[PDB]
């Protein structure tokens, strides 16, 4: 006879993401040699680590200006990749195509002011479960860093990944009133003669930043 | 961790500064070849459809992640639902060729028909953005014709990307972007 077989039900239907290859129609073509062209990237995270991008603030400017008043809160926002501030970054660009992430998100600060102006800043991480701090003295109990202006114009701060579950959703669920990942807060301790001087901020992936489960959300 | 921001050299600070410990990462799901290999829908045209990766919507997962690289290379797999006989033609061949059964032709077999197609363009690597709005006619994998085509899908194979470009998310009106998440 001939080798018998059983055609099984529920198998063989086409799957858009399935892991198998089409039957080749038309063979024996050779490509023009492309070897060692410049600027190649094999992974979309590496370009996210090596190329930080700007944030978004009120007035639609990627910087925050020093302020003189009783209010030392310079900028304050949710830690999420769906935030409005992050929205313009490349890092929050990839997020919309993945459900979950873990790892560190780095923030870069660069003081733009003139050489005769000096300021001192505080960045801090407010974990979830309590209202975020409205004053640097209140924030001083959180995880924080502090730096001032000088020869080096740039500071880099790693925002830890700290959560109960090993991964966290990228998207922000509509039934979530308060951010699950907490907030990060940026304060101005004081400023010498810094009125009207700008601090540009940047964001990029950290060493351990990991992103998984691709999904097409529209957007 | 302070440094000179104007340098543009990448500086990644870690949690060990204030006494944390960096954890282990598994990045498989962000791999370019992995993430771009899957089918994405393209609104077809009744008879002749030129195979082009830029026809994919920009907001789809495959469309967006494609457009973030200036220079891309990959093979192609198509999945087509059509009436009649689906005829494929290589890059740069005349339109009058699509009427010849000698060219690769897949006779109708329900529900649909899946093919695997080589990279047929003359250029060493294709491009998502071209400086010269229009993109040159030489960027395409060829065309397919059938009596009518109901659905069309693209699946990239062996994808390779170069020179990344901006990738944008949806800009919230409120402080966050709140969506309804699947819940029991």
């Amino acid at each position, epitope marked *: 006879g001939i080798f018998p077989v059983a055609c099984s039900d529920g198998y063989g239907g086409l799957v858009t993401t399935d892991p198998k290859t089409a039957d080749p129609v038309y063979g024996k073509v050779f490509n023009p040699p492309r070897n060692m062209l410049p600027g190649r990237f094999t992974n979309l995270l590496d370009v996210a680590e090596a190329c930080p991008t700007f944030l978004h603030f009120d007035g639609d400017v990627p910087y925050v200006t020093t302020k003189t*008043d*009783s209010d030392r*809160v310079l900028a*304050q*926002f949710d830690l999420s990749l769906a935030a409005k501030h992050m929205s313009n970054t490349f890092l929050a660009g990839l997020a919309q195509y993945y459900t979950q992430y873990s790892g560190t998100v780095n923030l870069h600060f660069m003081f733009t002011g003139p050489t005769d102006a000096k300021a001192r800043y505080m960045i801090a991480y407010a974990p979830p479960g309590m209202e975020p701090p409205k004053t640097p003295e209140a924030a001083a109990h959180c995880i924080h860093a502090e730096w001032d202006t000088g020869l080096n114009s740039k500071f880099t701060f790693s925002i830890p990944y700290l959560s109960a579950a090993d991964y966290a959703y990228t998207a922000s669920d509509a039934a979530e009133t308060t951010n699950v990942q907490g907030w990060v807060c940026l304060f101005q301790i004081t400023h010498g003669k810094a009125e009207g001087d700008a601090l540009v901020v940047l964001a990029s992936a950290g060493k351990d930043f990991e992103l998984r489960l691709p999904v097409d959300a529209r957007q | 961790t302070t440094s000179t921001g104007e340098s543009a050299d990448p500086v990644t600070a870690t949690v060990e500064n204030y006494g944390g410990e960096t954890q282990v990462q598994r990045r498989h799901h962000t791999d370019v070849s992995f993430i771009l290999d899957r089918f994405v829908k393209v609104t077809p045209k009744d008879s002749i459809n030129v195979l082009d990766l830029m026809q994919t919507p920009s907001h789809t997962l495959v469309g967006a992640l494609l457009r973030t690289a200036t220079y891309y290379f990959a093979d192609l797999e198509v999945a087509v639902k059509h009436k009649g006989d689906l005829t494929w033609v290589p890059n740069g061949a005349p339109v009058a060729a699509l009427d010849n059964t000698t060219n690769p032709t897949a006779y109708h077999k329900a529900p649909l028909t899946r093919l695997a197609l080589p990279y047929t363009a003359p250029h060493r690597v294709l491009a998502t953005v071209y400086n010269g709005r229009p993109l040159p006619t030489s960027f395409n994998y060829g065309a397919i014709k059938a009596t009518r085509v109901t659905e069309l899908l693209y699946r990239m194979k062996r994808a390779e990307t170069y020179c990344p470009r901006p990738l944008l998310a949806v800009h919230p*009106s*409120a*402080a*966050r972007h709140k969506q309804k998440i699947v819940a029991p």
Partner: nanobody, 117 residues
């Protein structure tokens, strides 16, 4: 934590209204406060903001100079004083609390305002 708008109504062009929003359930002096407006058939747009200290504000361009936001931490409430009203301003005005530069989360139900001409 729940918000309640009030002070809405009807008016004719050039008029003025004072909207009132009361907060409940937690400290009001720790929150930034802001207003959103949804004009019918358009998506909802931003209006104005006030920091917890009452010091800093921000106004949407179209409403810039016509409207004035103010909060009372003693009275646990926030106010939007609408002036030089214009038939475009017809919308439902949502009171919003929150932390972020835009106040966002913790919305009230919003009040109806129709200026006529």
């Amino acid at each position: 934590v729940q918000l309640q708008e009030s002070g809405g109504g009807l008016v004719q062009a050039g008029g003025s209204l004072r909207l009132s929003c009361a907060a409940s359930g937690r400290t009001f002096s720790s929150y930034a406060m802001g207003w959103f407006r949804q004009a019918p058939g358009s998506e909802r747009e931003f209006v104005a903001r006030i920091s917890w200290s009452g010091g800093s504000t921000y106004y949407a361009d179209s409403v810039k100079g016509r409207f004035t936001i103010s909060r009372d931490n003693a009275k646990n409430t926030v106010y939007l004083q609408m002036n030089s009203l214009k038939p475009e301003d017809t919308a439902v005005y949502y009171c919003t609390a929150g932390f972020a530069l835009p106040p966002s989360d913790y919305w009230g139900q919003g009040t109806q305002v129709t200026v006529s001409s």
